[PDB]
Design a protein around this ligand. Structure first.
Ligand SMILES: CC(C)=CCC/C(C)=C/COP(=O)(O)OP(=O)(O)O
Lengths: 104, 119, 403
């Protein structure tokens, strides 16, 4: 299938300092990259679809971008509810694949 | 829009169990349903889904040949038939519904389920 | 003189293959049409004048559209990136002007169309059945690829000829187009192409009158109604869904595919009524949603969409009445020119010109039908393909009709 690596695997940053999350891709996925936020013991919620478009009920702090095959999510500032795990997915290939999952 | 699933429990290895994902607020045969499992203390893992109307099914490498996903428009529910279970299949299984095709050309899960635990 | 014709018929032969199969083929075709223009150094001033019945309306429409979009940016301070996609419609002028300067051979366009369709079918088959891909578009976006497939299938459906081997080389074009379209989903393109190919059946058969078309569409309507009377029919399964969606939209439960897009349309039209002449400006459709009352009291997907998903509604809401008129002109002026060329060609005989005009009219109709559910200016590839195809078809049709 298509393999992704996320870096860092787990990061720790205080409130107000912007954080960036890097998601790689073994093969060429054009724009079918989505980002999710999962809090402990709850279903994940979609944050960004098509790697550059936010979802409903998502603050403007979250934003994503693409540079070739390097998909990156960044948070302008961390509010106390921004501390959760994040995943990156491909939908270009018929067999979708999630990232290993970073943690804040 | 709500997705609710039930059917988890204790299944010894080599057994069989069916997960039913009841849906409401939309029509199952219009959109598509994706099943995603998360092992205890590990990351998300995709297993299978169905197409919108044609009903074409694709399965993951580990679960192909033993998992039978299906839909029932009459009851507006989606099922994933699990067969030949092993100890490596213990996870929490979630449902998923892709966004509207015109909004996003590629699949992206917007509403999920509460998730069920299978051992 | 002769080399200009040969290197142009080669280019019109290769245009579909470059656009679809070649990854960066749009740039290659642009370079090809620009290096042909560098050999029209001595001409191209005595090309515009005799073809000013076709070239001037296109130039005027394109210039008016560009000026309106620039004036909807000067008054509303916007980043310049919103007019990059409109800036690509100027290539229709260059394509038509090059084509009318250096006369091509239209007989090599149809073979190029069928070769491009076959090779694109092979590419999509490889990209779906072996390198498993959800929506196997060759090297571009799925929507733009589907629009290109529909347009080129319609172009190939207008084969000039009457021989038995020509009808079976034109129905194969539709067959390849529908296979390619079904391979990458996007059933809307299939529906649009099949709907707009029915008027093309008068160009396809030079025996098929208008009464035979009225009865044909009546038979199609009867077949469509018969499906809705079969309870288990899938047509009734995808029509009852939309009916229930409309009924749900007619009360508070607006959180569905049909409902979401019928709610951005209402917000756009209500703002357009408020500001008829000047809307928010070119682009900037998110301002209408963010300043709306519904978004201030409800959290839904309708408040996140960057732009509306209907060309007429988006143009009217964003760039006002003049922008609506120029946007409709970009698709109506080519239709008028194609009708005027088709009438002259039919009065002169010359089946190649009539078929060319019919193909252009079908392309315009398909583009309008596609724009009924999406914004064409959003995708750069779609815009450049449309501009190039309209320019080339208009130039060749004018060359055929005039001389
Ligand atoms: C004149 C006619 C008959 C036009 C038909 C256009 C069409 C199939 C709309 C269906 O909406 P859709 O949700 O399928 O649009 P899309 O697939 O582009 O998102």
């Amino acid at each position: 299938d298509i393999q992704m690596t996320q870096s860092p695997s787990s990061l720790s940053a205080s409130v107000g300092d912007r954080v960036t999350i890097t998601c790689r891709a073994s093969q060429s996925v054009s724009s079918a990259v989505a980002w999710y936020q999962q809090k402990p013991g709850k279903a994940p919620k979609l944050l960004i679809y098509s790697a550059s478009s936010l979802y409903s009920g998502v603050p403007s702090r979250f934003s994503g971008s693409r540079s070739g095959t390097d998909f990156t999510l960044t948070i302008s500032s961390l509010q106390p509810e921004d501390f959760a795990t994040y995943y990156c997915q491909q939908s270009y290939y018929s067999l979708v694949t999630f990232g290993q999952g970073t943690k804040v | 829009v709500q997705l609710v699933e039930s059917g988890g429990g204790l299944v010894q290895p080599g057994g069989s169990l069916r997960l039913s994902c009841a849906a409401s607020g939309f029509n199952v045969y219009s959109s598509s349903i994706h099943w995603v499992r998360q092992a205890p203390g590990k990351g998300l893992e995709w297993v299978a889904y169905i197409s919108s109307y044609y009903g074409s099914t694709y399965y993951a490498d580990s679960v192909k040949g033993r998992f039978t996903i299906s839909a029932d428009t009459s009851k507006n529910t989606a099922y994933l038939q699990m067969n030949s279970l092993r100890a490596e299949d213990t996870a929490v299984y979630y449902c998923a519904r892709i966004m509207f095709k015109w909004v996003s050309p590629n699949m992206a899960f917007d509403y999920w389920g509460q998730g069920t635990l299978v051992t | 003189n002769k080399l200009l014709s040969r290197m142009a018929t080669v280019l019109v032969f290769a245009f579909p293959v470059l656009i679809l199969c070649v990854p960066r083929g749009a740039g290659v075709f642009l370079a090809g049409v620009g290096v042909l223009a560098l050999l029209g150094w001595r001409g191209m001033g005595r090309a515009w004048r005799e073809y000013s019945k076709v070239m001037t309306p296109l130039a005027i429409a394109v210039l008016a559209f560009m000026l309106v979009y620039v004036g909807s940016k000067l008054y509303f301070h916007t980043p310049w990136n919103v007019i990059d996609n409109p800036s690509r419609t100027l290539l229709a002028i260059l394509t038509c002007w090059v084509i009318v300067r250096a006369a091509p051979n239209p007989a090599w366009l149809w073979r190029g169309i069928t070769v491009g369709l076959f090779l694109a079918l092979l590419i999509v088959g490889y990209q779906k059945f072996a390198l498993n891909i959800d929506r196997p578009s060759a090297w571009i976006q799925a929507i733009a690829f589907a629009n290109m497939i529909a347009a080129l299938a319609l172009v190939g459906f207008a084969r000039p000829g009457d021989s038995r081997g020509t009808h079976m080389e034109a129905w194969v074009n539709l067959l390849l187009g529908t296979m390619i379209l079904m391979l990458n989903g996007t059933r809307g393109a299939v529906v649009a192409m099949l709907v707009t190919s029915v008027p093309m059946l008068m160009i396809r058969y030079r025996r098929f009158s208008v009464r035979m078309l009225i009865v044909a569409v009546c038979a199609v309507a009867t077949l469509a109604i018969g499906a809705y009377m079969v309870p288990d029919s899938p047509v009734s399964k995808r029509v009852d869904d939309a009916v229930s969606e409309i009924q749900m939209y007619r009360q508070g439960n607006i959180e569905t595919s049909v409902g979401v897009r019928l709610k951005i349309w209402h917000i756009g039209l209500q703002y357009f009524s408020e500001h008829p002449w000047t809307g928010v400006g070119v682009g900037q459709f998110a301002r209408i949603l963010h300043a709306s009352e519904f978004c201030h009291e409800t959290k839904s997907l309708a408040c996140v969409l960057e732009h509306a998903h209907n060309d007429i509604v988006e143009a009217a809401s964003t760039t006002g009445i003049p922008g609506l008129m120029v946007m409709l002109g970009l698709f109506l002026v080519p239709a008028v020119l194609f009708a005027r060329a088709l009438r002259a060609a039919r009065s002169l005989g010359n089946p190649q010109g009539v078929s060319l005009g019919g193909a252009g009219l079908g392309v315009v109709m398909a583009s309008l039908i596609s724009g009924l559910t999406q914004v064409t200016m959003a995708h750069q590839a779609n815009v450049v393909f449309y501009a190039g195809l309209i320019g080339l078809l208009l130039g060749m049709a004018g060359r055929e009709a005039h001389s």
